[PDB]
Ligand binder design. Structure first.
Ligand SMILES: NC(=O)c1ncc(N2CCCCC2)nc1Nc1ccc(C2CCNCC2)cc1
Ligand SMILES: [Cl-]
Length: 270
């Protein structure tokens, strides 16, 4: 089924309706399942993914369920290439959504985008599940403007060495705390750091972090104590929240449960 019964999905039940673009593993198409239900169809470019390891982990992701997590519906593994079938998010990638100036966002909307992500992240934390590549590019936006976290944990199965070497051209340097860039120490607290940068992305309407620095310069500078400036759209109270995510000591960073409380406190003042 589609979130019910088997999670090996029959490709014959799928109809391809539009190209959505490409992501980490290549082409993504919009389709319908059994003519009724919208789905996104991730066609996994062969050689890009550690497929056996992912399919085993997919059993684990099938059991995560939260409103603000993009739902994994199943896989199509009986063909070349394999497909991953997920919830359809009609407004696309959060990063691109933020950069479309026509939306004329209120800060009330930006803050709720942060709450959306923080709720998904608190749930993953409660399940001891790291995202490992949290950023605006890995969030999606549905037809109601709701933001949801996507492709949690999938960095573990990326075979492109430019993405997994901390010095590769594609490593999420700008979203990584010093202990990751320096020692490869991943934890819930490196997710917390990334969420702070993600909050800065949102309030910066999708500007790239540290845009005047190369990856290597950024890693050096954040390690010394350089930090992202307060976005003009972020109040002091909002900036204190993202800023708290970038403490030099991991154990001084908050949890996602604390961050959620902090965001809700600010929302409740409106
Ligand atoms: N699960 C999904 O719905 C979904 N997953 C991954 C993904 N992509 C492509 C972008 C890069 C990351 C991988 N796109 C997705 N949907 C999607 C939906 C609409 C658009 C259009 C709508 C008009 N304005 C924006 C463009 C683009 C992408
Ligand atoms: Cl800067």
């Amino acid at each position: 089924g589609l979130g019910y019964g088997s999670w090996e999905i029959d490709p014959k039940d799928l109809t391809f309706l539009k190209e959505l673009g490409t992501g980490q593993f290549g082409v993504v198409k919009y389709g319908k399942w059994r003519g009724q239900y919208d789905v996104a169809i991730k066609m996994i470019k062969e050689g890009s993914m550690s497929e056996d390891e992912f399919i085993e982990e997919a059993k684990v992701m099938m059991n995560l369920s939260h409103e603000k997590l993009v739902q994994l519906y199943g896989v199509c593994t009986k063909q070349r290439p394999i497909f991953i079938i997920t919830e359809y998010m009609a407004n696309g990638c959060l990063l691109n959504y933020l950069r479309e100036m026509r939306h004329r966002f209120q800060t009330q909307q930006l803050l709720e985008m942060c709450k959306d992500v923080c709720e998904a992240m608190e749930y993953l934390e409660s399940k001891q599940f790291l995202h490992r590549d949290l950023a605006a590019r890995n969030c999606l936006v549905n037809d109601q403007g709701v933001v949801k976290v996507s492709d949690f944990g999938l960095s573990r199965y990326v075979l492109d060495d430019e993405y997994t070497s901390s010095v590769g051209s594609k490593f999420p340097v700008r979203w990584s705390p010093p202990e990751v860039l320096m020692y490869s120490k991943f934890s819930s607290k490196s997710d917390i750091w990334a969420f702070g940068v993600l909050m800065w992305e949102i309030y910066s309407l999708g500007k790239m972090p540290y845009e005047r620095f190369t990856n290597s310069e950024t890693a050096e500078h954040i390690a010394q104590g350089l930090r992202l400036y307060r976005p003009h759209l972020a109040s002091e109270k909002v900036y204190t929240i993202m800023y708290s995510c970038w403490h030099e000591k991991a154990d001084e960073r908050p949890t996602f449960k604390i961050l959620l409380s902090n965001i809700l406190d600010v929302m409740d003042e409106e």
